[PDB]
Amino acid sequence: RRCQRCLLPEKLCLCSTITPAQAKSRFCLLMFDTPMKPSNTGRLIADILPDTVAFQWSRTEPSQDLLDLVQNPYYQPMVVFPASYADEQREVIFTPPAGKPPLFIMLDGTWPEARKMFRKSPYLDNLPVISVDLSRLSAYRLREYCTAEVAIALLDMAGDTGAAAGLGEHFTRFKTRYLAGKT
Amino acid sequence: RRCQRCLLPEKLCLCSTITPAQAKSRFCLLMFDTPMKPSNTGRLIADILPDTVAFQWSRTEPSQDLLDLVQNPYYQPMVVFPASYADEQREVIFTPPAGKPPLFIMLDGTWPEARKMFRKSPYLDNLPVISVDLSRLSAYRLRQYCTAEVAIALLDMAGDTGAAAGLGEHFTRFKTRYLAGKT
Ligand SMILES: Nc1ncnc2c1ncn2[C@@H]1O[C@H](C[C@@H](N)CC[C@H](N)C(=O)O)[C@@H](O)[C@H]1O
Ligand SMILES: Nc1ncnc2c1ncn2[C@@H]1O[C@H](C[C@@H](N)CC[C@H](N)C(=O)O)[C@@H](O)[C@H]1O
Ligand SMILES: [Zn+2]
Ligand SMILES: [Zn+2]
Hints:
Chain A has five helices and six strands. By secondary structure, chain A is an alpha/beta fold.
């Protein structure tokens, strides 16, 4: 009864609407649970930006491919999480750094899952935390938050406004259809 | 706060999505009530086919512009109503006639309002009733029935598949947003 790709009821399937975009930014999804939950919105990022990398998160045996990706000096990697959680010695930044393309590492799940991922992933500890400027959502007619909404604001912070606008529109489509599914 | 044109919550406003189409068929809406109610779907026809004529229905004082339109020999006028309610001497048909462009007269309101309009409008009595083949909605991945849904079937019956597809997509957008605004 539910689409296996877009996770909405079948009469509400949005797959035909999806128009991927392009961006200088790149996302990496560390997923606490890979089945796939409609309430987890990190997957919407991958619909709009299909170069999004996604992993199942592990407490003790992180993937070598994940380690390779976050250690690739081609990118500037950063952990996406509210600044108040970062240690006093943790580097916190407020814009993507200039030059190398950013790799936005999202902790995709619930808060206690996100928080657990933030604290028990030592391969992320030497990375800067970016504090997202959520007020930028106003320029996309979204409430100035879902993991997909955080990503929209990040894309806008990086000047990837085409992908921000495409993800906003895709997010609103999913959220509207989801609510309707509950009706 | 609701949009005054598309009658949805302001955050769910659909006006920007509307792309009118073109059709050989033409519609005429006799609306019981012209505030407008969100759940009256005759107005969705006008969004897709802006040459749709619309009048306020009156029992005793029909507009002369309405009388003039239905007496225009340029069109083949017909009243859109379930065939079971026609009189035995009423000409019932099952396809739009061939040759002159069809003028589909919709009774836009609720069922008791439509049935009242059907019975108390002497200017429509010498007109044929077209019985709508609603199984055609299957071709548009749709399935009582909204006035806008009946119009999609009529458009398809007349070969106006582009307008029928555009009205289907529009009706589903309205219906999905209306359900979500209800959530
Ligand atoms: N200020 C913020 N900075 C960074 N990420 C944020 C912020 N506020 C919310 N988030 C995101 O929201 C997640 C936690 C929950 N809100 C997730 C809700 C829901 N499961 C979703 O996927 O949208 C975090 O792991 C981040 O992805
Ligand atoms: N079998 C049918 N043949 C012709 N018109 C129909 C048929 N079934 C429904 N309709 C039309 O669709 C309306 C259905 C009503 N329930 C109105 C629902 C709602 N108020 C709307 O405006 O969409 C009728 O009043 C007619 O205008
Ligand atoms: Zn789907
Ligand atoms: Zn509107």
